[PDB]
Ligand binder design. Structure first.
Ligand SMILES: *[C@@H]1O[C@H](CO)[C@@H](O[C@@H]2O[C@H](CO)[C@@H](O[C@@H]3O[C@H](CO[C@H]4O[C@H](CO[C@H]5O[C@H](CO)[C@@H](O)[C@H](O)[C@@H]5O[C@H]5O[C@H](CO)[C@@H](O)[C@H](O)[C@@H]5O)[C@@H](O)[C@H](O[C@H]5O[C@H](CO)[C@@H](O)[C@H](O)[C@@H]5O[C@H]5O[C@H](CO)[C@@H](O)[C@H](O)[C@@H]5O)[C@@H]4O)[C@@H](O)[C@H](O[C@H]4O[C@H](CO)[C@@H](O)[C@H](O)[C@@H]4O[C@H]4O[C@H](CO)[C@@H](O)[C@H](O)[C@@H]4O[C@H]4O[C@H](CO)[C@@H](O)[C@H](O)[C@@H]4O)[C@@H]3O)[C@H](O)[C@H]2NC(C)=O)[C@H](O)[C@H]1NC(C)=O
Ligand SMILES: *[C@@H]1O[C@H](CO)[C@@H](O[C@@H]2O[C@H](CO)[C@@H](O[C@@H]3O[C@H](CO[C@H]4O[C@H](CO[C@H]5O[C@H](CO)[C@@H](O)[C@H](O)[C@@H]5O)[C@@H](O)[C@H](O[C@H]5O[C@H](CO)[C@@H](O)[C@H](O)[C@@H]5O[C@H]5O[C@H](CO)[C@@H](O)[C@H](O)[C@@H]5O)[C@@H]4O)[C@@H](O)[C@H](O[C@H]4O[C@H](CO)[C@@H](O)[C@H](O)[C@@H]4O[C@H]4O[C@H](CO)[C@@H](O)[C@H](O)[C@@H]4O[C@H]4O[C@H](CO)[C@@H](O)[C@H](O)[C@@H]4O)[C@@H]3O)[C@H](O)[C@H]2NC(C)=O)[C@H](O)[C@H]1NC(C)=O
Ligand SMILES: *[C@@H]1O[C@H](CO)[C@@H](O[C@@H]2O[C@H](CO)[C@@H](O[C@@H]3O[C@H](CO[C@H]4O[C@H](CO[C@H]5O[C@H](CO)[C@@H](O)[C@H](O)[C@@H]5O[C@H]5O[C@H](CO)[C@@H](O)[C@H](O)[C@@H]5O)[C@@H](O)[C@H](O[C@H]5O[C@H](CO)[C@@H](O)[C@H](O)[C@@H]5O[C@H]5O[C@H](CO)[C@@H](O)[C@H](O)[C@@H]5O)[C@@H]4O)[C@@H](O)[C@H](O[C@H]4O[C@H](CO)[C@@H](O)[C@H](O)[C@@H]4O[C@H]4O[C@H](CO)[C@@H](O)[C@H](O)[C@@H]4O)[C@@H]3O)[C@H](O)[C@H]2NC(C)=O)[C@H](O)[C@H]1NC(C)=O
Ligand SMILES: *[C@@H]1O[C@H](CO)[C@@H](O[C@@H]2O[C@H](CO)[C@@H](O[C@@H]3O[C@H](CO[C@H]4O[C@H](CO[C@H]5O[C@H](CO)[C@@H](O)[C@H](O)[C@@H]5O[C@H]5O[C@H](CO)[C@@H](O)[C@H](O)[C@@H]5O)[C@@H](O)[C@H](O[C@H]5O[C@H](CO)[C@@H](O)[C@H](O)[C@@H]5O)[C@@H]4O)[C@@H](O)[C@H](O[C@H]4O[C@H](CO)[C@@H](O)[C@H](O)[C@@H]4O[C@H]4O[C@H](CO)[C@@H](O)[C@H](O)[C@@H]4O)[C@@H]3O)[C@H](O)[C@H]2NC(C)=O)[C@H](O)[C@H]1NC(C)=O
Ligand SMILES: *[C@@H]1O[C@H](CO)[C@@H](O[C@@H]2O[C@H](CO)[C@@H](O[C@@H]3O[C@H](CO[C@H]4O[C@H](CO)[C@@H](O)[C@H](O[C@H]5O[C@H](CO)[C@@H](O)[C@H](O)[C@@H]5O[C@H]5O[C@H](CO)[C@@H](O)[C@H](O)[C@@H]5O)[C@@H]4O)[C@@H](O)[C@H](O[C@H]4O[C@H](CO)[C@@H](O)[C@H](O)[C@@H]4O)[C@@H]3O)[C@H](O)[C@H]2NC(C)=O)[C@H](O)[C@H]1NC(C)=O
Ligand SMILES: *[C@@H]1O[C@H](CO)[C@@H](O[C@@H]2O[C@H](CO)[C@@H](O[C@@H]3O[C@H](CO)[C@@H](O)[C@H](O)[C@@H]3O)[C@H](O)[C@H]2NC(C)=O)[C@H](O)[C@H]1NC(C)=O
Ligand SMILES: *[C@@H]1O[C@H](CO)[C@@H](O)[C@H](O)[C@H]1NC(C)=O
Ligand SMILES: *[C@@H]1O[C@H](CO)[C@@H](O)[C@H](O)[C@H]1NC(C)=O
Ligand SMILES: *[C@@H]1O[C@H](CO)[C@@H](O)[C@H](O)[C@H]1NC(C)=O
Lengths: 228, 339, 210, 97
């Protein structure tokens, strides 16, 4: 069960170098070829570059100048650095083991072949936004379920920036009925999202129906209890 | 014979180590161009722009200032040029040379004949047996092998300025090919006068080459060596490439289905004289890079320049190597143990 | 660009990406779903990693002047996804972005009514003299639904920041509308209502101040 | 084998019934043209405009945009052409095999 994921800042402003990191496990960092991939909103994924020890690296010509990849051995993790960012660079990023090969169609002697690259396992994805607008701590409030015996309850997250805001429910024990709706853009220059859970009428408790909200960019941890 | 604005055909993904260097140059790389030009239509007063794909060898740069990437066909420099008629074929057919009546040909049937002097076993014929007119260099193709054993012949071996003519006993298959699926186009210039040019490369950009068995070539290299060593006082003989000349002379030249080849015989003459066999390993085919050219002039001055129209689609022909044409380097050297 | 194809559950779908080939290619196919990163399905035209069935066929790299067709026999419901592909050709320089993926769909949803859910302003928010209603509507198909609030039969002009539908794990979609008000606007009107319209079929829920 | 700007030679008095129709076309009507062209003089560098009368059969239209009424001889399309020497004669003389 080899798995991996990355860790970024969430927000960067223009003319700043965007540093990122892909923490890994399952296998060694020497024993793999490593890639970086970004995919904007409603667009196709763009291959950034790839790297290996013994001084080997190659970048996408679009940003061969701005990107500066790295590699830590002991820590078992990868790195990234992208200078002079703009709103164009804002996309959700990834990192993956790049399994390579060779495609032969003619005389090997004459170099009648080419080498190709596929990536068999992906990370979760670090959402990266590029704007000159400051962060914002999400204001959080409870949604009253009161008016078969069923009545859904939830939490409303509002006035924050940037997307995304991760939201759990009471130490993540209950997962059923949890419909965390996609956020909404406002002319406020901010976002808002609402997570709801469907629950029967027979549920007094007293159960601490708490929503575990987390908005890392602003470095804010809000926690609100839902009541009738 | 007009201006050609040529450009190379497709981009590539050449990379890897190192990087600090910039411009590369290699004489041995068979490559095509995408030349463009204006030619006259049915009427003298008008003309149109065509494009064709020409082997870099067949073109030559001209320094124009009004434009860039300008070339010309090598011949507009020297001689007129015609295109081989489609109907005709230069297939080497066995022809019999026959004497008039009252004359007769005499055939030497001696199985270990030297070329000169008495023949113990003779037979009269009116006609020579079927002889195919093969035009090739270094390697003698599709010919007659020696009955007894492989033979070396020369007017006098000592005169280094006279060609050694080797005749194998057992032939060595050589399979050459132009592997690319080249589409061809007809380009007309009036009244109905038209010339076939290569149009496109369907599929991979493949390179022309020849194939000999390494085991089967190195063998005759040895067998020939042993017969040579017998003639030059048991001196260990060694082989090497050509010292210079026209391409046709410094390469193995021939034609398959009409396209004229120029295969690098460097590989055939590295040497590899000491036989160990290496546990029968490192021995498959031995591939030679081949270069291909269309505008071609044989017999030097006598005869005009010929343009060989491209055969559409990939081609490959197999000939049997039946002999060789060699020449000895001759000067004073180490008397013992030199060679 | 055109990226859609309709195939019944049980029939076979063939999806195409990139320009026509010039030389031998090593076409790699990926599949992405909402939230998740793109996953590998096929490499070297028809070779597949661990966990992918035999139904996933692919064009051979051997053909020339030919579009790369990914063929998936007996299409499964959970196979509706984005299919961005990565072409490696002999006669064209290395591509550093992926190709446009023919998005996949299925005929029979069969159907799905929305789950309309309408909440009043929380008691806490009203202390900051601000108010915001929340119309949580979801699990509908096709993912298109007109929304219309009503103050009291009277339509509400402004303060309704809503969302375009978004795909989930289940093929159904989800969206949400937000009507923002202030206490004195809220408590004045006797009722407020959110009307969701799906396939010429209006559904509505109602909420009111105490 | 150059461009020919051809025009029919003389007007006529074709009239009478009926009248409502406009354009006529008939394959069987032997008719000449008055073709004009530029040809080279004694020197390669110069040329002059000549006119000749050519049977419509012997010419064929070419679609040029820079000019109108443009034709070419049918052969520039296909084969070279020579003119029968004045001295020679293709009179069928009885020959004995
Ligand atoms: C040394 O020695 C060696 C040996 O001897 C050599 O080699 C050789 O050589 C030869 C010569 O070169 C060769 O032959 C050849 O071949 C070829 C091929 O073959 C194949 O094919 C065929 C058909 O054809 C087609 O196809 C192809 C492919 O495959 C192509 O390439 C071509 O081109 C064609 O095409 C076509 O079609 C297509 C479709 O597909 C299209 O697209 C196109 O367009 C076109 O149309 C066939 O037929 C054949 O067959 C055969 O074989 C088989 C087996 O294999 C069989 O079964 C059959 O039946 C036949 O056989 C027969 O015969 C035999 C004998 O021979 C016998 O044995 C048997 O039994 C039988 O009977 C195959 O498959 C071909 O092609 C050729 O032909 C040609 O040529 C000739 C002469 O050579 C003649 O005769 C003919 O007629 C023809 O002609 C043509 O061409 C020419 C040139 O080439 C010319 O001149 C003429 O005129 C004509 O032309 C025309 O056409 C062309 C085209 O073709 C063009 O280009 C132009 O323009 C025009 O139009 C031949 O046959 C062989 O193979 C070889 N061998 C080996 C082993 O290798 C060498 O060379 C030597 N060396 C030295 C140095 O010398
Ligand atoms: C003059 O002399 C010179 C020099 O001697 C000579 O030059 C030589 O020319 C030939 C031909 O031009 C040229 O051959 C090429 O070689 C390519 C590479 O093959 C090698 O690698 C493969 C892969 O093995 C790797 O992976 C293995 C598994 O992990 C691993 O074990 C290996 O170690 C390796 O890591 C390998 O399979 C090959 O070995 C096979 O062939 C040997 C030949 O002797 C044989 O002894 C072996 O036992 C072995 O046989 C198996 O594999 C073959 C297939 O290769 C099967 O058919 C058998 O049943 C066995 O299972 C080599 O080690 C080769 O791939 C080239 O062919 C592909 O590419 C062209 C160009 O596009 C296509 O047109 C072909 O159709 C073919 O494409 C198939 O494969 C690619 C992926 O590579 C796919 O994308 C294609 O779509 C297609 O496969 C798919 O489609 C079909 C339907 O189309 C479908 O049905 C399939 O199921 C599949 O889904 C090509 O043949 C050679 O490089 C060159 N140079 C040298 C030094 O030899 C000249 O020819 C001579 N001149 C003349 C005139 O003769
Ligand atoms: C150094 O350089 C050298 C030169 O540069 C290199 O030399 C090369 O080596 C290669 C091998 O190493 C050689 O490749 C050999 O090719 C033959 C070709 O035969 C095929 O073509 C015949 C005619 O062309 C048809 O097929 C082609 C290809 O499909 C088409 O493009 C054509 O259009 C044409 O199409 C017709 O046919 C198809 C059906 O095939 C129809 O659909 C079409 O409508 C057309 O009608 C063709 O006659 C052959 O057909 C026979 O075989 C079929 C299976 O392939 C079969 O289905 C047919 O029914 C038919 O069999 C019957 O008919 C024949 C007639 O003679 C009978 O003899 C036979 O008994 C049946 O009754 C064929 O399609 C290929 O056959 C060879 O395959 C053998 O060798 C490989 C080597 O790897 C083995 O692995 C195979 O197992 C196979 O062995 C056979 O023989 C065994 C006994 O010895 C037997 O036990 C096996 O079961 C098997 O049958 C080779 O692949 C290449 O030719 C050669 N080149 C030169 C120039 O010398 C060298 O490699 C290189 N070395 C190194 C190290 O670098
Ligand atoms: C360069 O490259 C070239 C290309 O690669 C390469 O060319 C190939 O070379 C080989 C030689 O190595 C060519 O020859 C092959 O040789 C095999 C061995 O031959 C032996 O058998 C012969 C026949 O024996 C008959 O008699 C026996 C007596 O008991 C029987 O047991 C046999 O079964 C057979 O039966 C006869 O009677 C039957 C009665 O019922 C009848 O049906 C049957 O058809 C047959 O008539 C022997 O004659 C021979 O021995 C002779 O020579 C020795 C000394 O050398 C003497 O001592 C003997 O007394 C005798 O004189 C051998 O022992 C063959 O198996 C092989 O078979 C092919 O041909 C037969 C017909 O002969 C076909 O039936 C069969 O299908 C085979 O395919 C052929 O046809 C297909 C379809 O047309 C074709 O595609 C294919 O290419 C092939 O032509 C074959 O003969 C070979 O043909 C060459 N190929 C080509 C394309 O050219 C060349 O060598 C290379 N050279 C160099 C220098 O590198
Ligand atoms: C470079 O130069 C080297 C040498 O300097 C060459 O290499 C040699 O090439 C020859 C080519 O012929 C190779 O000869 C092969 O010999 C074997 C062995 O033969 C035995 O088995 C066969 C049965 O398979 C028997 O019939 C034989 O018996 C007699 O007749 C055969 C007929 O070939 C003859 O070769 C034998 O010498 C023998 O004759 C002698 O004995 C009898 C009594 O038994 C006597 O009456 C007679 O007068 C003689 O004294 C023998 O037991 C053979 O199998 C090979 O093929 C032959 O048979 C097959 C069928 O099996 C036929 O199809 C084929 O046509 C042949 O007839 C060969 O003949 C030799 O091995 C080889 N040596 C080495 C080291 O390589 C290279 O080739 C040269 N290279 C180049 C590029 O030029
Ligand atoms: C046909 O065209 C070729 C090329 O335009 C002419 O031959 C070439 O002449 C140049 C010199 O003008 C040669 O380049 C160099 O010449 C110097 C002598 O100054 C020499 O020292 C160099 O080593 C080098 O050769 C060139 O090699 C030569 N050949 C080719 C293939 O380019 C030729 O003159 C033209 N034909 C006629 C009849 O004029
Ligand atoms: C383009 O490719 C041809 C292939 O032979 C080569 O000769 C030429 O130099 C190339 N162009 C440049 C500018 O080098
Ligand atoms: C001879 O040249 C060939 C070129 O194809 C090469 O493969 C071989 O290794 C060479 N051998 C030596 C001894 O140089
Ligand atoms: C002029 O007369 C010629 C006579 O053959 C005819 O072909 C031509 O069509 C006439 N012009 C027009 C415009 O019809």
């Amino acid at each position: 069960q080899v798995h991996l994921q990355e860790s970024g800042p969430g927000l960067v402003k223009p003319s700043e170098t965007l540093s990122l990191t892909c923490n890994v496990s399952g296998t060694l960092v020497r024993d793999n070829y490593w890639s970086w991939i970004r995919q904007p909103l409603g667009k196709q994924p763009e291959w950034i570059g790839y790297v290996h020890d013994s001084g080997d690296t190659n970048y996408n010509p679009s940003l061969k100048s701005r990107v500066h990849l790295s590699l830590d051995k002991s820590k078992n993790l990868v790195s990234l650095r992208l200078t002079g960012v703009t709103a164009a660079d804002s996309a959700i990023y990834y990192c993956a083991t790049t399994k390579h090969g060779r495609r032969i169609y003619g005389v090997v002697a004459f170099k009648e072949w080419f080498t190709y690259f596929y990536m068999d396992v992906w990370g979760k994805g670090t959402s990266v936004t590029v704007s000159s607008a400051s962060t914002k701590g999400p204001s959080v409030f409870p949604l009253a379920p009161s008016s078969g015996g069923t009545a859904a309850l939830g939490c409303l997250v509002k006035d924050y920036f940037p997307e995304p805001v991760t939201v759990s429910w009471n130490s993540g024990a209950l997962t059923s009925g949890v419909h965390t709706f996609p956020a909404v853009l406002q002319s406020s220059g901010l976002y808002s999202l609402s997570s709801v859970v469907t629950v029967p009428s027979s549920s007094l408790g007293t159960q601490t129906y708490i929503c575990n909200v987390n908005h890392k960019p602003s470095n804010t941890k809000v926690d609100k209890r839902v009541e009738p | 014979c007009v201006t050609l604005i040529c450009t190379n055909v497709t981009s590539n993904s050449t990379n890897s180590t190192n990087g600090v260097t910039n411009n590369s140059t290699v004489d041995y790389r068979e490559q095509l161009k995408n030349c463009s030009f204006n030619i006259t239509t049915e009427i003298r007063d008008k003309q149109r722009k065509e494009y064709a794909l020409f082997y870099r060898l067949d073109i030559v740069p001209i320094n124009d200032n009004e434009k860039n990437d300008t070339y010309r066909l090598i011949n507009c420099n020297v001689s007129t040029i015609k295109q081989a008629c489609p109907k005709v074929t230069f297939d080497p057919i066995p022809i019999h040379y026959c004497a008039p009546a009252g004359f007769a040909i005499l055939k030497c049937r001696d199985k270990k004949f030297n070329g000169t002097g008495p023949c113990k076993n003779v037979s009269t014929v009116q006609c020579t047996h079927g002889i195919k007119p093969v035009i090739s260099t270094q390697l003698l193709l599709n010919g007659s092998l020696a009955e007894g054993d492989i033979m070396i012949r020369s007017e006098n071996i000592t005169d280094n300025a006279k060609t050694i003519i080797v005749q194998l006993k057992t032939a060595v298959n050589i399979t050459c090919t132009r592997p690319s699926n080249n589409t061809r186009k007809s380009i007309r210039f009036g009244p109905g006068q038209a010339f076939y040019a290569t149009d496109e490369i369907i599929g991979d950009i493949r390179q022309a080459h020849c194939n000999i068995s390494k085991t089967e070539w190195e063998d005759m290299k040895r067998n020939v060596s042993d017969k040579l060593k017998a003639l030059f006082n048991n001196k260990t003989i060694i082989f090497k490439s050509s010292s210079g000349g026209d391409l046709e002379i410094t390469t193995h030249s021939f034609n398959c289905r009409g396209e004229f080849f120029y295969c690098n015989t460097s590989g055939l003459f590295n040497t590899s004289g000491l036989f160990n066999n290496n546990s029968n390993d490192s021995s498959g085919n031995i591939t030679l890079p081949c270069k291909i050219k269309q505008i071609v002039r044989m017999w030097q001055r006598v005869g005009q320049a010929m343009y060989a129209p491209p055969i559409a689609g990939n081609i490959t022909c197999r000939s049997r190597i039946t002999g060789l044409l060699l020449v000895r380097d001759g000067c004073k050297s180490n008397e013992t143990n030199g060679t | 660009a055109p990226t859609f194809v309709s195939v019944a559950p049980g029939q076979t779908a063939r999806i195409t990406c990139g320009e026509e080939s010039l030389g031998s290619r090593s076409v790699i196919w990926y599949q992405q779903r909402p939230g998740q990163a793109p996953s590998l399905i096929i490499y070297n035209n028809n070779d597949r990693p661990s966990g992918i069935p035999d139904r996933f066929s692919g064009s051979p790299g051997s053909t020339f002047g030919t579009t790369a067709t990914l063929t998936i026999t007996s299409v499964e419901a959970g196979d509706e996804a984005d299919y961005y592909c990565h072409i490696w050709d002999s006669r064209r320089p290395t591509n550093w972005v992926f190709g446009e993926g023919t998005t996949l769909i299925v005929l029979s949803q069969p159907k799905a009514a929305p789950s309309v859910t309408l909440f009043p302003p929380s008691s806490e928010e009203l202390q900051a003299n601000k108010a915001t209603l929340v119309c949580l509507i979801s699990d509908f198909y096709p993912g298109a639904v007109t929304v219309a609030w009503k103050a009291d039969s009277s339509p509400v002009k402004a303060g309704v920041e809503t969302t375009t539908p978004s795909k989930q794990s289940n093929n159904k979609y989800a969206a949400s509308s937000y009507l923002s008000l202030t206490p004195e606007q809220w408590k004045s009107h006797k009722s407020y209502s959110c009307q969701v319209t799906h396939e010429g079929s209006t559904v509505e829920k109602t909420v009111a101040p105490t």
